[PDB]
């Protein structure tokens, strides 16, 4: 219903754009892994990013980050107590392994559809 | 053992008996179908004048098939023949015998199960079935397919038929085998699938009635133009025989309604 005056509809986009300003991405400070080189390596801060996604996430944090025969979960701090198959100082590991398998972050950030490249009840019986 | 409602056999009948003592004049035998009704076999009815040695021809406890040709309703006198017996009833009575042994076992099972006996099992099952539709051995395989009406339509006393049907269906599923042929059906008609379903039904119609052995048949589709035929019964000949009679009828009735059906040449 507008010609060149369609700018005010385009302004509707750059006005609903601050309705979607800084969402999809990383903010205040990502990797909480510290520099440890003992037998293998154990993070002093793994029992705080656990609830800074959702819940316990034993079938998530420790579940996904584990190579071969990796013993030990998180009762104290960190994991991989022996033989993690991941003995290093790679401060950047908790970023790529959770680049799809987040919990809850798909491809919009606000509010979307929460879990929706990795499923299981999408093939067994069509729910939708 | 096998019991009998008729203590004395009919004349000309073909039975089965187990040798008990081949002593003097001929050989003394016992008909295992009448509970052990002591019969008798004159030596003159064994073989020929082929230098006879009844000592070995008839051995202790060797079950054989004879034919009653002498019956006196006083004491016994049940003279029977051996080779003068129709030697095509050789396969006849031998086959029925297999089914009679089957009936005995299944009878013994059901009977020993509850508070019954071989005396009562025959006295209430085989007896009453004999008075309904011929021999029970064949009327039982008829019941397992029709239901529990068959046995109450004989006189069987109430709710111990089920143990019989549960135990009889056991033995049949044990001896399970399948004969399956392959066909291809491709008809183009106003209602093709309606004809395909209609013609298969015309062929299959009244096949389990003539061919008595099978339990179930399945002409399901495997591909799109090709369909499978399955016959499952308790008889080698019956299966492969019925299977072909089906397929032959499929082709024959097919062209009658313009339905191209051919047996896969693989």
């Amino acid at each position: 219903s507008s010609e060149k005056e369609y700018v005010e509809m385009l302004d509707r986009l750059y006005s609903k754009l601050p309705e979607k300003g800084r969402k999809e991405g990383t903010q205040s400070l990502p990797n909480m892994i510290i520099l440890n080189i003992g037998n293998t390596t154990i993070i002093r801060n793994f029992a705080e990013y656990c609830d800074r996604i959702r819940r316990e996430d034993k079938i998530c944090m420790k579940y996904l980050l584990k190579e071969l025969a990796a013993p030990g979960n998180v009762d104290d701090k960190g994991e991989l107590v022996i033989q993690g198959k991941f003995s290093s100082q790679v401060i950047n590991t908790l970023m790529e392994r959770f680049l799809k398998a987040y919990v809850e972050c798909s491809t919009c950030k606000s509010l979307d559809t929460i879990l929706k490249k990795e499923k299981k009840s999408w093939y067994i019986v069509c729910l939708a | 053992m096998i019991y009998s409602r008729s203590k004395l056999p009919s004349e000309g009948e073909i039975l089965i008996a187990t040798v008990k003592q081949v002593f003097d004049y001929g050989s003394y035998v016992s008909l295992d179908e009448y509970g052990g009704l002591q019969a008798f076999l004159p030596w003159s009815e064994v073989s020929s004048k082929w230098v006879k040695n009844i000592r070995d021809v008839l051995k202790e406890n060797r079950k054989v098939i004879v034919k009653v040709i002498r019956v006196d309703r006083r004491k016994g006198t049940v003279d029977v023949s051996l080779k003068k017996v129709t030697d095509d009833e050789r396969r006849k009575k031998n086959l029925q015998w297999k089914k009679i042994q089957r009936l005995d076992k299944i009878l013994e099972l059901v009977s020993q199960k509850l508070k019954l006996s071989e005396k009562d099992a025959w006295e209430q099952v085989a007896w009453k079935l004999e008075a309904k539709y011929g021999d029970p051995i064949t009327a039982i395989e008829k019941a397992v397919k029709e239901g529990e009406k068959i046995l109450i339509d004989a006189g069987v006393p109430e709710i111990w038929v089920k143990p019989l049907l549960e135990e009889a269906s056991k033995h049949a599923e044990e001896r399970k085998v399948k004969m399956s042929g392959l066909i291809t059906v491709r008809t183009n008609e106003p209602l093709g699938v309606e004809k395909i379903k209609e013609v298969i039904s015309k062929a299959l119609e009244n096949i389990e009635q003539d061919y008595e052995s099978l339990l179930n048949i399945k002409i399901y589709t495997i591909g799109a133009p090709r369909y499978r035929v399955d016959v499952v019964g308790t008889n080698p000949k019956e299966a492969s025989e019925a299977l072909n009679q089906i397929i032959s009828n499929l082709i024959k009735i097919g062209k009658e309604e313009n339905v191209d059906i051919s047996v896969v040449k693989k």
Binding site: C108 | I219, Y227
Partner: protein, 414 residues
């Protein structure tokens, strides 16, 4: 809530930006035209991007926000229930090798068009500029050019990004065609595009008193391996009814039909059958009208459809009076340079006794040329294509139905 109706409008999705055109569909409808739950739901019904959604309006509210798709007035922000307008459907047109070869079926398969823009590039594309005029060739005057992928841009990327289009429009037919800025990923300002479809792409007149004619683009065997003979279903012929009125339990016929060798001469004889069921997407109806991809169960031997066999042909009614013709008279057309991935001036002319692919509806008939005039061409078709009443826009080519080798078009003088 709203009535359960069938799609009454077909919208064409024409773009070049990867997934840009695709996501825009899920932004309205919500149906994934990438990894489908359509093959995992029935059998193997998968060709083009087929999406469908209802369109209502939350009246007593401002815009562009009243126009909603689901019965939930959560877009306009209210606990109300809108009025129902219509159910519309879209065609992504991914297919197989097709990057334009789809739009040659007619007009009732695509009653409207939405030209989705690319994204960073100046304006045209190897596809955008290609099949742009392909809308002014097959018969689509109602178009909506959308400015998608403006997810990360600026106002200045519209002071000339929009004025560049007004140049490309000024020089042909589509002048005052609307240009709506929409968010690709985010479902924002989509309300505007929806309101746009509701204004510039209205529901064309449907004459439901004419000879029923569905263009078959698919056909297959719905029965699973192992199905008993008692539970066998007829063949499935999912097409696009372009006119008329089809109902359940109706007698029809498949033209041209089958080949029949009959003492020296061969011909194509119809396939008479009955309509068993109608299925628009996933809901079972009792009658189908133009617009919307409909799946029709029949009483045919599955050996006729199964492997997409009955593809290409069209379907009418048993009583039809429809000429299925071998030879045809075609008024060819002079197209410019054509193959955007090589790029020339003119093109190889149309000589006699030459083999060309005549895309009649969805048929790939190879007809050797026999006569050549100025505006007429007699053809020696391999398969006898069927014509109902009007001349067909068969986009002639050479090989098969694909982007490789395209040349001219023209109607079918009958």
């Amino acid at each position: 809530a709203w009535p359960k109706v069938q799609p009454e409008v077909n919208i064409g999705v024409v773009g070049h930006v990867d997934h840009g055109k695709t996501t825009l569909v899920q932004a309205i409808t919500g149906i994934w035209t990438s990894k489908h739950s359509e093959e995992l739901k029935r059998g193997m019904t998968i060709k083009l991007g087929y999406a469908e959604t209802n369109i209502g309006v939350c009246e007593s509210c401002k815009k562009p926000e009243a126009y909603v798709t689901e019965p939930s007035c959560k877009s306009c922000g209210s606990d109300d229930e809108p009025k129902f307008l219509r159910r519309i459907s879209f065609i992504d047109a991914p297919g197989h090798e097709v990057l334009m070869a789809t739009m040659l079926s007619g007009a009732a398969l695509m009653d409207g068009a939405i030209l989705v823009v690319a994204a960073n590039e100046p304006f045209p594309q190897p596809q955008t500029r290609e099949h742009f005029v392909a809308l002014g060739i097959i018969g689509v005057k109602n178009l909506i050019i959308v400015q998608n992928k403006v997810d990360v841009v600026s106002k200045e990327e519209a002071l000339s990004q929009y004025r560049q289009i007004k140049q490309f429009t000024k020089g042909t037919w589509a002048e005052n065609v609307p240009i709506i800025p929409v968010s690709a990923l985010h479902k924002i300002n989509i309300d505007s595009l929806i309101e746009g479809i509701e204004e510039y792409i209205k529901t064309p007149y449907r004459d439901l008193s004419q000879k029923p004619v569905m263009l078959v683009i698919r056909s297959f065997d719905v029965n699973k391996p192992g199905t008993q003979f008692n539970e066998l279903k007829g063949g499935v012929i999912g097409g696009s009814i372009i006119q008329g009125l089809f109902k359940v339990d109706q007698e029809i016929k498949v033209l041209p039909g089958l080949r029949v060798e009959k003492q020296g001469k061969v011909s194509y004889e119809p396939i008479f059958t009955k309509i068993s069921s109608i299925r628009f997407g996933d809901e079972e109806f009792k009658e189908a009208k133009p617009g919307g991809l409909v799946a029709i169960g029949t009483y045919l031997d599955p050996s006729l459809t199964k492997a997409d066999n009955l593809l290409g042909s069209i379907i009418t009614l048993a009583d039809a009076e429809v000429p299925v013709l071998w030879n045809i008279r075609i008024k060819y057309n002079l197209l410019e340079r054509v193959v955007g991935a090589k790029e020339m001036l003119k093109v190889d002319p149309i000589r006699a006794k030459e083999t060309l692919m005549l895309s009649v509806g969805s048929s790939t008939t190879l007809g050797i040329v026999t006569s050549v005039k100025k505006d007429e061409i007699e053809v020696e078709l391999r398969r006898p294509v069927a014509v109902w009443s009007n001349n067909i826009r068969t986009v002639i080519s050479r090989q098969i139905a694909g982007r490789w080798r395209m040349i001219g078009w023209g109607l079918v003088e009958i």
